[PDB]
Amino acid sequence: ERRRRNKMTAYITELSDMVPTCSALARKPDKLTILRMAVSHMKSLTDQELKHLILEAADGFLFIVSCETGRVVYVSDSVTPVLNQPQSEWFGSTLYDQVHPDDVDKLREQLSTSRRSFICRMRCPHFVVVHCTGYIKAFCLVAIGRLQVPTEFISRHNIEGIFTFVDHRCVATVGYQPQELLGKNIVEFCHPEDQQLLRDSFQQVVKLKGQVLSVMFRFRSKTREWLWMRTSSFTFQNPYSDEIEYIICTNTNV
């Protein structure tokens, strides 16, 4: 029934020692005295340090904007560590001025006829994604803004080898516009000699699901030049069903 007692005493020790003007004693006082000591000391002592709590956990800053003009009524200095921006810049300013041009319409609708939240790119022509979260108050928005976050080319295939995706770098790599590979099977750009080598390779990647396999072969460039290439690839399986979405390859000139 009484380990209540011993962490009440643990409480009294632990507590007693972070009261400094009490910690500073060779002998340490009784129950009530340690208590009133803490009391009077607390009195001696949650406000803007809250603001920095925000800045530390969330990487965020406070700002109020009139829903009328979009002009910034108030901006927390925490804007500076976040956006690398002087409070100056945000006081004579409108929030539309502070975002990406394409982010404007969205903003018009968050400032229209409750409580608000949205994502937008704010400048520090360099922008960063920012999550603003706030609410409307007497006609204004009190919200907080928060941050977070060629040699070769990648492709994707259905299991048969048809190109289903290529990164634009393909054009530099093999001379082809994406359009010229997409839809066609990869073994068609292959030297007949190496075609079996390519085929069997697909087998191995599918038979063994998830791990990576490499193969080297001659790939038909757009100037029709056989290109030694290593491609190394693995299947991509749905997280829920674990059946096979497709195959991902990286094709690197060798």
């Binding site: 409480y11 709590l53 009190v142 907080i144 997280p239």
Partner: protein, 292 residues
């Protein structure tokens, strides 16, 4: 003598930086817990710094500070708003006593040893509104913060919001969609078309993975995994391929929704926030974009 004791306790309780509204209603133990944890908080804050209905209300989530042994030294007030549970009820207690175990290891891994932390955890929720801890429910929190030295976790726990029960307005740059557990499109609204170029009719057979930039697939994988295990996710920023050349950037919050009378999963509902315009218009990435 306990006359003096009890009365000094309550006196103490009163001008902790809180309303006597709640100060009043404390067992001495709570006064202790809170006293200490309040001190510890002021310390750690001194460690990092070398009228606030605004910051509290502006937030759509709350601040937690949690030691390495998992005891939650500090929690902002408005947690009650999101979690039901009051600060009072919680400071000093082990995070692990209020989190879905199965999330505990992962919590342990984000508790220790880059200092940037970003993960999802299920926490006990008791909210129409308020219930009691008996039939508590699991609520998913997106937690982002920094770990610090001691060892110490400072995070912001953001609820993800359940699409059928909104509290915020939505934009023109935001479309909404439904999926099988496969993330196969089963439904999408007709904001798609204006935003990325597809008719909703087009996507029905299609798994969502068909439309991610390869560079994002795995990240998406992570999200999927989590959506299923935990029940909700916010994805990172990722590109979705547009009806013709190029892509737009996105962020999707996914919620598994349940059959109410069946208590089985049904679908995934996705609030999809479009973050940009089609970036590469000249560039074609997939088979569908080649047509026409």
């Amino acid at each position: 003598r306990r006359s003096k004791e009890t009365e000094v306790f309550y006196e103490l309780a009163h001008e902790l930086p809180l309303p006597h509204s709640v100060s009043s209603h404390l067992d001495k133990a709570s006064i202790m817990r809170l006293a200490i944890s309040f001190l510890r908080t002021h310390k750690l804050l001194s460690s990092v710094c070398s009228m606030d209905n605004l910051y509290l209300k502006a937030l759509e989530g709350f601040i937690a500070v949690v030691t390495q042994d998992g005891d939650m030294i500090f929690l902002s007030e408005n947690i009650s708003k999101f979690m039901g549970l009051t600060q009072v009820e919680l400071t000093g207690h082990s995070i692990f006593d209020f989190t879905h175990p199965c999330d505990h290891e992962e919590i342990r891994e984000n508790l220790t040893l880059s200092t940037e932390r970003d993960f999802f955890m299920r926490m006990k929720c008791t909210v129409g509104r308020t219930v009691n801890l008996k039939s508590a429910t699991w609520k998913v929190l997106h937690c982002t913060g920094q770990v610090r030295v001691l060892s110490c976790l400072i995070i912001m726990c953001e609820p993800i919001q359940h699409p059928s029960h909104m509290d915020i307005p939505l934009d023109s740059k935001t479309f909404l969609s439904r999926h099988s557990m496969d993330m196969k499109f089963t439904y999408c609204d007709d904001r798609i078309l204006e935003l990325i170029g597809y008719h909703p009719e087009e996507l029905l057979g299609r798994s969502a993975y068909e439309f991610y930039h390869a560079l994002d697939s795995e990240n998406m994988t992570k999200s999927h995994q989590n959506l299923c295990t935990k029940g909700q996710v916010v994805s990172g920023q990722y590109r979705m391929l547009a009806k013709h050349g190029g892509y737009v950037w996105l962020e999707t919050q996914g919620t598994v929704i349940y059959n109410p009378r069946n208590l089985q999963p049904q679908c995934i509902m996705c609030v999809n926030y479009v973050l940009s315009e089609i970036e590469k218009n000249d560039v074609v990435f997939s088979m569908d974009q080649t047509e026409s």
